[PDB]
Write a protein that binds this ligand. Sequence first.
Ligand code: SRM
Ligand code: SF4
Length: 535
Amino acid sequence: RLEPRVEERDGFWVLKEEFRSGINPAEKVKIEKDPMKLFIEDGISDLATLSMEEVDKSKHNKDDIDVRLKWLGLFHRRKHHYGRFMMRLKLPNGVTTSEQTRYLASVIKKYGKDGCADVTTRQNWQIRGVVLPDVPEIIKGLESVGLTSLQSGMDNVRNPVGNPLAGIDPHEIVDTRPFTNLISQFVTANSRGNLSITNLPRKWNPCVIGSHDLYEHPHINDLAYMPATKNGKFGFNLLVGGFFSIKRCEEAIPLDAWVSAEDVVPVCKAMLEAFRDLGFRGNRQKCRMMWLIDELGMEAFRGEVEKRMPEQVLERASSEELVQKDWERREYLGVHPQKQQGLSFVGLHIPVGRLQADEMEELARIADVYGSGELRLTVEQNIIIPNVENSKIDSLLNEPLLKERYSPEPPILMKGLVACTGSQFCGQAIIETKARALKVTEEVQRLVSVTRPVRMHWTGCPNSCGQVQVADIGFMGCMTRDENGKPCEGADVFVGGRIGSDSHLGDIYKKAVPCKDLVPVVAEILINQFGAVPR
Ligand code: SRM
Ligand code: SF4
């Protein structure tokens, strides 16, 4: 045991025969045909042929559409958008150009009532509505503007998140951009696909911290790079194993490793390989990297990463940390000064992250006209317009879709509002979230007033995409039954989760609250635990 269970064969990575025992349905799909063959052997061109009738006629085509295709970031919404797809990108740091968002808006347009977009909770774009016939043209389209959507989906490395203010931030510990990009470019082998790394046992979330506020939520990632100097030289201490699941939630923990700026990619490479090689591949809810870790114990696991890297030395964690523990999270919504003299950024609302095609164009145009032609997406499903001259602020704050839809200064509960895709499009969802979230917040601001910023997170199912455990107040979809037995959408309410340097995970606080009784419960928590007032 601790002998690598996957080897290279004819260019692709595959689980050896003798380690094939308990393996789950996803592991059987991967074996039957490496999903990357859809992109590498252009299997994708043949997929754009099939009508949906033909696809569902055979078990192999139905795996491709529903599973394999996730490696090309294409997610079939079988239950809710049959024959249409949600497409997930690769966007290190949340940085997107106005050409990108424009190009995205144009792909969206083509579906009218059936296209929209979303900022995800890893500051990523999701596009909605696509159909197979369009994919080959959309991949060319995304490549021609900087994006790839490669490996965004199953057992790959997910969007590397960084500080949303990377490179414009007045109090910035390290510009995070190079590192998230370095990682993104590494994993994706420059949009060409890194096969050594697409046969993991499970998803894997990386992040890189550059802000004292810890906007990058290091505690919630499989690998979290934490700024600390070692010998004059700058670098990161490694936090490891953080994750949410149906069955388990674990906060990331020190690996006790320091790594220099140059060694960032190397460790990530080494650690992905340790995972790929050694991770469990049976029951799927025991497959995220943390399980491997407690199975071997920390040291033995460090040993495993250590021995996997260039010189086979992994330096120990340094005591010289750069993030300042006693620190209060800055608001980013609104007008804020940059570190560049005479420039400000403007954080914009984005109700629940949802955007339409017409509105995406306007942001893009506003970025061009006021800023540097770019935008910063953020983990609270909002976007910041960076680099505007202070002269232009006034006019900018006077623009139609800033007054109307995407406010720089929304009401206070909206400011920290986050919600997952929900049952509007997501096959997995127990409740509808995005609309329900705006309705419940609405009625809550009506009934109480709060001064403290408060973070509410809706998630539609225990997968916790919406990160209920990090929220002040959280909402996990469940179904409930009336005293008459009538099925009503409802949510578990989580209280007490904490963000930043003194992070904590929230606890179920009242179980199975039905959707009609939801507002009272929230109000009563607001007044009792967040100094809110009636009226
Ligand atoms: C878009 C997003 C929700 C959102 O509205 O923002 C998302 C979308 C999906 N998540 Fe997620 N997850 C999203 C953040 C998360 C997070 C938060 C994070 O990464 O910081 C987590 C927890 C972190 C973690 O992994 O521990 C998360 C943990 C999951 C899991 C649980 C993994 C597990 O071991 O149980 C699933 C189900 C799975 O993978 O087995 C899941 C499954 C899904 C699927 C693919 C479900 C499905 O089959 O369709 C959702 C796609 C729904 C759709 O059509 O939009 N999603 N999901 C967020 C992803 C943005 C991105 O670029 O990746
Ligand atoms: S939390 Fe559940 S309902 Fe929401 S996007 Fe994730 S899997 Fe879907």
